[model samples]
Target: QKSLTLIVALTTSYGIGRSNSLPWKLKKEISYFKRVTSFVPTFDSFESMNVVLMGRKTWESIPLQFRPLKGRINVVITRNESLDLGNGIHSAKSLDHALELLYRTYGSESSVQINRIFVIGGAQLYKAAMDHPKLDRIMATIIYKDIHCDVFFPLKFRDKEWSSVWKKEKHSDLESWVGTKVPHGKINEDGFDYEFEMWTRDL
Candidate 1:
């Protein structure tokens, strides 16, 4: 099975979203997310693109004009096959289904080469990926403020409950995978402080 990374941003208390939208606005953090999720390593940059998997609600949460995130293969996981909006948005019922769809359809036979997989999501999809065997890494943005949230990732992977299993890596390792240097410590944006971190566990 191919490795997968889960990219997320949450407050100190682990609040991810409220009312189906991100609670805070962090400009630099968003840029970091885009760079890490979409950037390809130069050594194997041959006709490949990263695939981002998110739940249907998160897909819908995005504005119509920005519905499909550009430069990466987008797959939305829904409980059922949604009607074709003719926008060519791919839908899968589960995380495993998304993997099946990508591997079966975007294989060597096709021009679309799937380079890496990332779960950029809502609570449900994040929960699924957390239990997935191939989920090896997590790109998390630790927000300093604990904003109120109606929905959250069920577990605090960074806390003592799971921190030992998901070990944090050095900032240098983050730069290595992202193919460029990143902000070393906390960055302030819009009056809030946040920092990027990489966590890993054995498959």
Candidate 2:
């Protein structure tokens, strides 16, 4: 089976979205989102790709021109079986079903090797992944502004269950480890402070 990562952007208040679109205007973060989700290991290698799973609402939030995000396998979770999202896109009835499909198609025992499986989504999809067995990392971009938001990330993990991944620091007491923070504190294109955080659990 493949491991999963829950990747999302949240405000200081854990606000994620508003009116079906991202509440903040962070251009740098947008580019970072694309790079992280779409990145696949390739150095004159086969066309192995990563996967980004999102709910139907998240699917629609993307611009039409960028639908079926390039260089990555786009998997959309939708209850509507009849909805056609066009070519180069896969659909699953639920988040669990999407994982099953990914496992069958790109699990370790399978012929292909996907770089990573990411849950990039609306509130519901992120909530669904909280209990999934394959969930390994929670990659979050913490935006430092208190923006108005109607949608929020639903899971509030226990402090003991998750250890923050960070860079350039190690402390046994804090459970600090290398490679936990992809990017340290930085300002986005909109001039708002933000940081890339990874929270992981040992199972």
The candidate scoring highest on TM-score is 1
What TM-score fits each model? 0.96, 0.80
How do the residues 79-175 of candidate 1 rate in per-residue lDDT, one tens digit apiece? 8766747456778888898899889988779887899899997899998998898999999999898899998887788888886688999999988
Per-residue lDDT value at 90 in model 1 = 79
Q: Evaluate model 2: give its TM-score.
A: 0.80
Quality of model 1 by C-alpha lDDT: 0.87
Residues 83-176 of candidate 2: C-alpha lDDT, one tens digit per residue: 6647757789887888778777765676666767889877988888876777867767778888899998886552333334222122231123
Candidate 2 minimal-lDDT segment of 10 residues: 166-175
The alpha-carbon deviation from the true structure for residue 146 of candidate 2, after best TM-score superposition, in angstroms, is: 1.2
Query: Which segments of model 2 are wrong by more than 4 Å?
Result: 42-45, 105-112, 158-183
